[PDB]
Amino acid sequence: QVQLQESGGGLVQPGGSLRLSCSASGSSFSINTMGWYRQALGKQRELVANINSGGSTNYIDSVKGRFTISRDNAKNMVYLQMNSLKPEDTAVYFCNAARPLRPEGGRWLNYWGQGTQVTVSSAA
Amino acid sequence: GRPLRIGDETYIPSEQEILEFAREIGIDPIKEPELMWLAREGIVAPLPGEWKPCQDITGDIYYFNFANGQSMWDHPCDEHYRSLVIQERAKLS
C-alpha cells in the first residue's frame, strides 16, 4: 500500500522560499511517477510538477523556473523547492504517486497524500 | 493530459491493490476467496491495442486510445473481468 505524508507547509512571506517534503511508503517507489499538485480554495486541483522513474520532469507554466521537484529514491522521499513565492501560490499542496503495473501499456494506480497548506502572505 | 511513461520485482501488485481491484470487479474478498484469482489476473492485464495510460492536469488517471480517440476511466478489460466474476460465481454455486 502506497501512502504519502506531506510536510513543510505554512505561512511564508511573498518573495520567500519554502521546501515541501513528502514521505512515501511501499516498495514501488523508484518506479512511480511522483508529483506535487495544488488546490486553491474553491478551485480544482492542478499540477505543479512531476517526475517519472527516469527523472523526466514536467512543470505547470506558472511555476516553471521558480519551483523544482526532486526525489530521493533511497529514502522514498519527494521534495518541492519553491522560490519567489507569490500570493497566487496560496493553496493546499498534495503529493501524488502514479504507480505502474507494467513498464508499458499497463494499468496505473493513483495515490494521494492528505495535503499541506501553503499561505503566501505579508503577515507571515 | 499527458501519457504516463516510466522513462529510463517492483511491478507485482500488492495484496492491498489486489483487494481493491477485486472489489471493483464485484468480488467480496472475505466471503469469496475462491474468486480472487480473477482479480490477480485482471489487475495486470495489458491495455488492448492502442490504449495508453494518461493523467490529466488535475492528476486523474484515465485511458486513451490514440488510434481512434476513445477515452475511459477504467482499464478497457475491466468489464470482461466483471463478467467473468459473475460467471465464476455461478459456476461454483
Residue numbers in the entry:
A (entry chain A): 8 to 131
B (entry chain C): 3 to 10, 20 to 104
Copy the relevant paper text.
One of the earliest steps in cilia formation is the recruitment of tau-tubulin kinase 2 (TTBK2) to the distal appendages of centrioles through CEP164 that is located at their tip structure (Bowler et al., 2019; Cajanek and Nigg, 2014; Oda et al., 2014; Goetz et al., 2012; Yang et al., 2018). TTBK2 recruitment requires a conserved WW domain in the N-terminal region of CEP164 and a proline-rich region in TTBK2 (Cajanek and Nigg, 2014; Oda et al., 2014; Schmidt et al., 2012).
As expected, the CEP1641−109 structure derived from the second crystal form (obtained by co-crystallization with nanobody 10Z) is very similar to the first structure (root-mean-square deviation [RMSD]: 0.86Å over 87 aligned CEP164 residues), including the position of the bound nanobody. Surprisingly, the very N terminus, including the short additional β1-strand of the WW domain, is highly divergent in both structures. The structural promiscuity of this region might argue that the short β1-strand is only weakly bound. In agreement with this notion, NMR experiments with 15N-labeled purified, recombinant CEP1641−109 confirm the high flexibility of the very N-terminal region of CEP164 in solution (residues 1–23). In both crystal structures, the bound nanobodies are partially sandwiched between the WW domain and the helical bundle, allowing the complementary determining region 3 (CDR3) loop of the nanobodies to interact with residues at the interface between helical bundle and WW domain.
